[PDB]
Every structure is written in structure tokens, then in C-alpha cells.
Amino acid sequence: KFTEIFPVEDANYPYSAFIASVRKDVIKHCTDHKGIFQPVLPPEKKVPELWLYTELKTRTSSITLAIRMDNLYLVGFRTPGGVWWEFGKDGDTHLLGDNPRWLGFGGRYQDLIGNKGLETVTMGRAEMTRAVNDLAKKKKMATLEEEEVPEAADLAAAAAADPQADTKSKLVKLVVMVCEGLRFNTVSRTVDAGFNSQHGVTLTVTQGKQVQKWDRISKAAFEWADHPTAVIPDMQKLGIKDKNEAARIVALVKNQT
């Protein structure tokens, strides 16, 4: 519904700038709840009602990300050839229009990276450049070549069971840098700090666990609006005690209403 553009490879355009710019356009569609420091996103619906489109470009290629405004999560992406790829599998219901194709897997961190924590997702500008260039070529196929050389049965079977391992990998790097970067200022701070480092940057185990509990800390955000002194198990479980620390972690909360 509204576009953002990020020139990945442009070293002079800081990641923090893109975040600050995109959050400002998103907050335009948010509400101010008393007792809740962070802006409250639009209420969730079965059919995403406002869409954030972020176009990530390199010097070579580019892709557009289709993000729901209500929960700030990726639904699919568009290639340069105009093919939309959506999270899901045959049998599901497409949220994207324009002849979208099913990726075959879902957007859960665990459709994506199994049971390995978010701390295993290496991020950075170079990491984002390769992900876009890679996904800009998302192919429909692997007919490819066990005729090249079973008796690599080991290779042959890995390819057969996890064909889009590469895609899942590139996708979960953008999900954390963009979606999660927008939701959590703890992630945007960490991703921006090491965005141009030569060996990439990652989020700590603890950060990953909080990131995965966005809904929960969003609920607490609302609970602390009513009772700001309340202690929250699910929160202290995560290394968060009070709305004050929570304000150093989440930037935008999920609307409970």
C-alpha cells in the first residue's frame, strides 16, 4: 500500500536511517495508547488491510518485500520478472494477488531454520546484498544434475529433501534484519552497529528468545499500561522486568485490541 526503498549496496546510506525512515511511515498508521510508550500497530485481521512494501536494491538486481502492517511480518516477495512468492503450501489461501506461487514452506522461524535459535542468522549489508541477488533469481526448478555425478547418493538425497535450503536461508536473514529490525529496537541497534562489519553480525541467544516472544511482550506492554508495577513471569523469564527495560527492546507493539 506504501513503498519504502533501500539501496542495499550504498555504503553511505546507513541501515539505521532506513529503519528510522520506515518506522516513521509505519507509525503514521499506528495509535497512541495511554501507558504504552511504543506505538500500537493496526489491529490484526484475517486479510491484511494495510501493506508495507520494501524494495531492496543492489547495483545488480532487486526484490520487493510484501509486509503486513498489522504484525509487521513478511508474507512474500516479488522478483524482477514480476513473480510473487508467498509463504505457504498448496492447500492454503493466498493473501497475495497477481498469480502468486507457493514457496512450499511457511514463514515461521522454524519452518525456516528448524530449532536453531535466531543467534545463528548472520546479518550485515553484504549478507543482505547476497540475499537479494539470490532471491531475485528464485527459480521454480530443480531438475539438476544427478546425471553430473549418484554415486553421490548423499548429495542427491540432501538436494531432494531440502531443495530451497538456500532460499530459506536468504529469507530468514531479511526477516530478522527488516521485519524484526522494525519491531525491535534491540535488533535494529545490533544490526546497525555491525551492518558494515567484515564478518557479519548476529543477535545473542537472549535477544533471539525475546524476538520470538514479540506477541508476549506486546501483551505485557498492555498489561503494564493498566498495572505498571506488575511483575511478569513470562517477562522476567526473558530478562525483562518492567516497562522501562521493555522500552529498550521493542519499538512497536502488537495491538491487543
The residues carrying an active-site annotation are 180
Distance CA 157, CA 168 (A): 18
Distance CA 3, CA 34 (A): 29
Distance CA 16, CA 125 (A): 12
Dihedral sign, Cα of residue 135, residue 139, residue 142, residue 148: negative
* 249 in Cβ contact with 213 (< 8 Å): no
Other CB atoms within a 10 A radius of the CB of residue 161 amount to 8
Q: List, as one string, the DSSP characters of 135-180.
A: HTT--S-----TTT----HHHHHHHHH-TTHHHHHHHHHHIIIIIH
| C-alpha cell of residue 65 | 518485500
* HSE-CB for 20 with a 13 A CA cutoff: 7
Q: Please, what is the angle between helix 125-135 and helix 165-174, to 10°? A: 130
